[PDB]
RNA sequence: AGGACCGAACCGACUAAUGUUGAAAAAUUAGCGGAUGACUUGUGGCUGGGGGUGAAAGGCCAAUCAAACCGGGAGAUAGCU
RNA sequence: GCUCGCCGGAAGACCAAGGGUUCCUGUCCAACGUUAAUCGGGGCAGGGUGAGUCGACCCCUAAGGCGAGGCCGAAAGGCGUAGUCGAUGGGAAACAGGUUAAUAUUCCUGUACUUGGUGUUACUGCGAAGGGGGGACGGAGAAGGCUAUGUUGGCCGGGCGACGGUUGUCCCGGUUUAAGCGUGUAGGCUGGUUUUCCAGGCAAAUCCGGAAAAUCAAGGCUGAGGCGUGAUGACGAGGCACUACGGUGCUGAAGCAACAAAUGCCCUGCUUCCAGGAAAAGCCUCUAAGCAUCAGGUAACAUCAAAUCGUACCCCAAACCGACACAGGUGGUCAGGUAGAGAAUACCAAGGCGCUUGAGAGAACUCGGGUGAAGGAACUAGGCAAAAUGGUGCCGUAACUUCGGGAGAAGGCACGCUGAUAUGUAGGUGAGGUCCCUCGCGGAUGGAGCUGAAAUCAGUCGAAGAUACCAGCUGGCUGCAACUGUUUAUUAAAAACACAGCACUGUGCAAACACGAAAGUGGACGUAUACGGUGUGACGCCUGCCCGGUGCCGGAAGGUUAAUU
RNA sequence: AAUUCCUUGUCGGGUAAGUUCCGACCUGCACGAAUGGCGUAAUGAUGGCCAGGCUGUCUCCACCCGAGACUCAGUGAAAUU
RNA sequence: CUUUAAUGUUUGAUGUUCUAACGUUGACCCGUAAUCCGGGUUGCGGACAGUGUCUGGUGGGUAGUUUGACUGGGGCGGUCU
């Protein structure tokens, strides 16, 4: 749920948070856990290539399975788990057989419901099956844009895309950015909607809260002197087209240069 | 509970006086600010010069930065002293 | 040597880093020491650093580095796999006492302990470059139970006072004792046991995981401290003999209890929160390939081994970094007493210093301070500076407000000492004894003794009772920015920079973008509720007109238009 | 007005006297709506202004305690020329 | 030799389809106790993509340079035969 905080303190009047109960309050299975290493917005050479990442709480990767290869075997979900690595939550999956293994949470799943994954499982939110038997019109997540590599596509808090059209060996999709695209109809895909729908209406509230996340400060441009097109000058003048550093327009000017593709983009958005 | 309050250590450096061939190539004294945090700190590591890093001042990169230092081209050129 | 003064959360003590003989002894005073110098971190010579348990080395690994082949690249070379290095992390074991001019958890004494090799005996399914477990981990907060430690009493020993009094409810000192072994408590977690079965744990598996039944609820694990042992010992205030007053042998009394109590231990705990909290090995198990009157495994005993390097000394400083014996800078550990909320502050203990030029005089003027008649900002660019306020508790507290605040608003009253309430109360602590008992480090009862506020009443001294150090000036109008924060190390801390939030725009993943001749890496082991860029900059009411120009995004009828032909 | 040249704009408030400050007027030299506009509680070593209190800031300095200055002994610089 | 059709070949454009180059930062296998690499199998793409030479456009992203003289100081202005 969606919880305001108090102005007890400058910093806490605009905070909100996101309260679930249904979270686990523990620690996570150790066997599906990894190291992971912050970078610093630095590459093997050590020169920043992304800017504005720096610090940040320490984090584990939690092993998620977005490939769902293990058809013929009911499972169940034995909690929800809270995951830093992304913006939705995590499902701890028991199989028969003893595995265990991490899936994305969709929208209303909860502890005890059962899900399976392969051609014959049920049309219900959290199984997977290949789009070319997923009804036309439904909503899936967590899509494969090539068979057998695992989901791709709608993975984020309260993401999902939705099939439109089947024609042949191929399925066209709207996703959640409006784009109309089409991917081999061989590609699994989950039922439902991935639920962390209220993780938007989120608010930081104060800097330190972004610092936590490995976001670190942005400067401008306007006020940077040799350093940025925008440069300079006596005041605030930015007497130019707006640019990015590197000197490319950042409003309006479009970048995909692909050209490789080319065939399942059909409405590419907007 | 808190980038919450007062306040030592700790990290800072707003004012004043001294000092200015100084005790010190930026400090001392009396006060001052923050002090559970975007905190501070030890050890080690990466980023190299038209490049790095930069909560950005053209700031910092070994008391040196509108393009570091050593060496070399090199006895640069100097219609000027 | 007798006094004086200073530090005492250090100006004491123990280390790392760094330095590298500055340590000790003797000797010398040319130079070095901001003076002299018999002295010295100076010169010369000699002497000094003793480890199975401390540390390094070693085993393991993080960031990261190198990188067989390999991919890429004019050459140089770059990235990186298998692997190999790499602590600031993980991994076996020693405590006390004594001793040297200089070393010791290293030597001596006493008591111990760990990992291994070999051998003997006995019982035996052993085996990994694999699987599983464990190792293995955050912040804040809350108490409770303990100890270090301290205070007092008691006991022991000594003492009866340079000046009035001081044989007593007086004074001084001491009252210490380890790891280990044995008990396994406060308290913490966990439901256990047996059999069957299985698409899983790369193959297997008795192990892990999972499923299904039965049978019991007490089973285990962890765990500070305490007690006992260690210890008929040691140390011991002090004496007896030598005593070159430089010390050595021997002897050596009491060696208890209560109260208070940590930031330390139980605690890698418990509760809680979101920012969701290393790895690998050692260690405990599991089997596979393979080996079985073998080999290996387990227990006991005996025996052997545990090498090598470091260890001196300084280490908030005269020995490190600063050209100096430089008001500088430098990480960790130990943390006494009185008052106190306190590691503040004042005065002291232990301990260590008086800062390597002195003497004398007592002008101007400068520096650092104290006081001040009457006035009280008239000073001045400006109340700069200085003065002033300053505490606990009670009462009381405005506009405005985002209802949290404003606010310690402002402002007012009371604070000492003595006695009594109460020969020291409320409270805390908790003995003996008694009762019970799964007979224990138990529970109940018991209230001794110890400790101990705050308040009230009365009385009393002083000019002054938050008497010292310590320790908010306050209020009103207003500009800028929301705020905490960041910045020109070395003249600018700000209205600038960040900021949460808003918006535009790009990006469908081999993403955009960025570093790279490239490979490739980051973005991201992320996937549009995501990432990047730009501008604005909490929140509230809002954000109007203009697309001619420039730019961006689209489109077409035609025109013009490169190589090429 | 952090924007206003003319300018110490004009009126009023505050002061015995106010080029600054506060509040209104608009004639906006040359505000203007995300290079954001108008407000805004709280915060600020922020800018400006007015009070109470307090004082050697001053009227107007005086005295005193210390370190230098001065004298004696010892050691023994510098810029400049 | 003036003329035009169904053909054959010729080459030109467009479109569809295919697979064999090429790609695969898809899956499985081996080297191999290796998310690199390579090989093999298969699948999806597929003569597109991408690369090389040539070429037009864009291009302060980055460089090399220029930006006059006289002048009752210089600049503005004016002037230069």
Redesign the pocket.
Same mark, same amino acid.
């Given at each position: 749920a969606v919880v305001k905080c108090?102005?007890?303190?400058?910093?806490?009047?605009?905070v909100v948070?996101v309260?679930n109960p249904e979270?686990?309050?523990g620690?996570?299975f150790?066997?599906l856990?990894?190291?992971?290493?912050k970078?610093g917005?630095?590459?093997?050479?050590?020169?920043?290539?992304?800017?504005?990442?720096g610090?940040?709480?320490?984090?584990?990767?939690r092993?998620?399975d977005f490939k769902r290869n293990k058809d013929?075997?009911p499972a169940v979900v034995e909690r929800l788990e809270?995951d830093?690595?992304?913006?939705?939550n995590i499902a701890l999956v *028991?199989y =028969?057989? #003893?595995?265990?293994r991490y899936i994305l949470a969709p929208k209303g799943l909860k502890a005890g419901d059962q899900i399976q994954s392969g051609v014959d499982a049920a049309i219900k939110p959290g199984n997977t099956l290949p789009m070319r038997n997923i009804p036309v019109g439904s909503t899936v997540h967590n899509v494969e844009?090539?068979?057998?590599?695992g989901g791709?596509?709608?993975?984020?808090?309260?993401?999902y895309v939705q099939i439109v059209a089947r024609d042949g060996?191929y399925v066209t999709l709207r996703?959640?950015?409006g784009?109309m695209?089409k991917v081999?109809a061989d590609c699994r895909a989950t039922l439902g909607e991935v639920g962390?729908?209220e993780?938007?209406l989120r608010? *930081?509230? =104060?800097? #330190?809260?972004?610092?936590?996340?490995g976001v670190?400060?942005?400067?401008?441009?306007?006020?940077?002197?040799?350093?940025?097109?925008?440069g300079?000058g006596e005041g605030?003048?930015?007497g130019k087209?707006?640019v990015?550093?590197?000197?490319?327009?950042?409003?309006?000017?479009?970048?995909?240069?692909?050209?490789?593709?080319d065939?399942?983009?059909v409405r590419r958005?907007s």
């Open positions: 108090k102005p007890t303190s400058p910093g806490r009047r605009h948070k309260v979270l686990h309050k620690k996570p150790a066997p856990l990894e190291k992971n290493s970078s917005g630095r590459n093997n050479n050590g020169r920043i290539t992304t800017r504005h990442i610090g940040g709480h320490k984090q584990a990767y092993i998620v013929g075997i809270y830093p690595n992304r913006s939705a *028991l =028969k057989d #003893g595995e265990r844009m090539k068979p057998g590599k791709q596509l709608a993975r984020s808090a309260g993401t060996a996703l959640r950015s784009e695209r081999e962390n729908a993780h938007m608010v *930081l509230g =104060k800097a #330190g809260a972004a610092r936590w996340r670190r400060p942005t400067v401008r441009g306007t006020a940077m002197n040799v350093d940025h097109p925008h300079g605030r003048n930015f087209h707006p990015t550093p590197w000197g490319v327009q950042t409003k309006g000017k479009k970048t995909r240069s692909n050209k490789r593709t065939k399942f983009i958005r």
